[PDB]
Amino acid sequence: DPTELPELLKLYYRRLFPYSQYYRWLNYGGVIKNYFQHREFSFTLKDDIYIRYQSFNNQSDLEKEMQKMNPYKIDIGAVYSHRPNQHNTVKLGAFQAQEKELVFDIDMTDYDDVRRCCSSADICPKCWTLMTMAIRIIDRALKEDFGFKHRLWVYSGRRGVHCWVCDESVRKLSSAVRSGIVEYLSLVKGGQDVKKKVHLSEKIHPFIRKSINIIKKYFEEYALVNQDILENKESWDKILALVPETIHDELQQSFQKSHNSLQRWEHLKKVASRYQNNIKNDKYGPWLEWEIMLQYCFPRLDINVSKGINHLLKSPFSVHPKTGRISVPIDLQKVDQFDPFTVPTISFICRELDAITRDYKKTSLAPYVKVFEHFLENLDKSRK
Numbered sequence: 001d002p003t004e005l006p007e008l009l010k011l012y013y014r015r016l017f018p019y020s021q022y023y024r025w026l027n028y029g030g031v032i033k034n035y036f037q038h039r040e041f042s043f044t045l046k047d048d049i050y051i052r053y054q055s056f057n058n059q060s061d062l063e064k065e066m067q068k069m070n071p072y073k074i075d076i077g078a079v080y081s082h083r084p085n086q087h088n089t090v091k092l093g094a095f096q097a098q099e100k101e102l103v104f105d106i107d108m109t110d111y112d113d114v115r116r117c118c119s120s121a122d123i124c125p126k127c128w129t130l131m132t133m134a135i136r137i138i139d140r141a142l143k144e145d146f147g148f149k150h151r152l153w154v155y156s157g158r159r160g161v162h163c164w165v166c167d168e169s170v171r172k173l174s175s176a177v178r179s180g181i182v183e184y185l186s187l188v189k190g191g192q193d194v195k196k197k198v199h200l201s202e203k204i205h206p207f208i209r210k211s212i213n214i215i216k217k218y219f220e221e222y223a224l225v226n227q228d229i230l231e232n233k234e235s236w237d238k239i240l241a242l243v244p245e246t247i248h249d250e251l252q253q254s255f256q257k258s259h260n261s262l263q264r265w266e267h268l269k270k271v272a273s274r275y276q277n278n279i280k281n282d283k284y285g286p287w288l289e290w291e292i293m294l295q296y297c298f299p300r301l302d303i304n305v306s307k308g309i310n311h312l313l314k315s316p317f318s319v320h321p322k323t324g325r326i327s328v329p330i331d332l333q334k335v336d337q338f339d340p341f342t343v344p345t346i347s348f349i350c351r352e353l354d355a356i357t358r359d360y361k362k363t364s365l366a367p368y369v370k371v372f373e374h375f376l377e378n379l380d381k382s383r384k
């Protein structure tokens with residue numbers, strides 16, 4: 001019921017929202033003129049009403065407007081050529097997005113075809129490991145393959161995670177280059193009319209090998225125990241749909257003679273590595289095994305979020321109105337331990353604040369601000 005939110009939001013924006021850390025972030029050291037003043041913010045108010053092209057002069061101005069409007073959620077957009085809140089006085093064609101963080105949005109709902117426990121916006125500990133693998137796979141590539149140093153991972157508050165890549169030269173990337181980065185990171189392709197969504201080449205690129213090796217660390221506990229993807233014929237038929245027909249019968253017989261998913265996976269790998277893809281040559285390998293693991297575990301991005309320079313994205317420390325959860329930074333050093341269900345709601349921290357220094361340090365929000373500050377300290381070091 002979003003009728004209790006206004007009272008809780010007013011307290012949150014008055015005593016708990018981390019304004020000074022937030023401004024340290026988006027002011028980026030104050031080195032570039034008008035960088036914060038030219039940032040678009042988009043507030044959502046009651047009744048799904050929202051406003052585009054809000055912008056503020058400084059931290060005090062942001063605080064006062066957030067505390068005046070108490071928005072249900074806050075989205076961050078690009079840095080523009082002029083003040084967004086003056087964009088109607090700008091000659092046509094001159095008001096232009098110029099810079100923005102490279103962002104990623106990952107939605108558990110995009111995995112429904114390979115999730116057995118949950119569907120739609122639901123999540124649980126048995127499928128959250130998909131996000132753990134997505135963070136590790138994507139973050140490794142952003143850090144090691146692209147050399148991006150300033151990466152803020154955030155729980156979106158309901159069904160997934162965000163990443164904000166904030167390096168100086170990343171923020172200037174064109175939409176076309178952003179799109180190229182997405183394609184580099186993408187392997188799972190196809191809608192609901194495409195049964196087999198992953199096709200690998202004979203020689204696998206090191207990004208693919210390294211991503212497979214990450215999944216291999218999690219696959220037994222995630223796919224074979226928690227999801228039990230080969231529990232019975234209803235489940236293992238979905239996997240047989242991803243391999244050549246000419247081995248279904250052999251695998252059916254092995255599955256029926258095995259006791260559990262662990263044993264049945266071992267048989268699939270043995271058979272798959274004996275399949276002859278090209279009768280021309282005598283070359284064999286684990287391509288099928290890899291294509292299955294990738295289809296079930298490899299990150300699926302909400303790609304349109306990443307391609308557009310102008311694209312809004314929900315802010316860190318925004319409330320998610322549908323759950324009350326605060327969109328909190330994720331401690332990269334404890335990603336395996338992240339529990340979305342310990343993430344505090346706005347109701348929970350407002351209760352803590354006044355249960356028997358009146359700021360977020362009295363509440364469960366404090367450790368999440370600490371992660372944010374570590375990210376901000378690295379940005380500070382990078383500028384001196």
Ligand SMILES: Nc1ncnc2c1ncn2[C@H]1C[C@H](O)[C@@H](COP(=O)(O)OP(=O)(O)OP(=O)(O)O)O1
Nearest residue numbers: 075105107156157158159160161305312313314320
């Ligand atoms: N009406 C809209 N106008 C502009 N941008 C929007 C709108 N709706 C969604 N978006 C963009 C910005 C959002 O931050 C982004 C992600 O949407 P979505 O994944 O559904 O929510 P979310 O990532 O904030 O939380 P969650 O996925 O956990 O529910 O898409």
Ligand SMILES: [Mn+2]
Nearest residue numbers: 105106107156
């Ligand atoms: Mn999302």
Ligand SMILES: [Mn+2]
Nearest residue numbers: 105106107302
């Ligand atoms: Mn989305």
Ligand SMILES: [Zn+2]
Nearest residue numbers: 117118124127
């Ligand atoms: Zn689940």
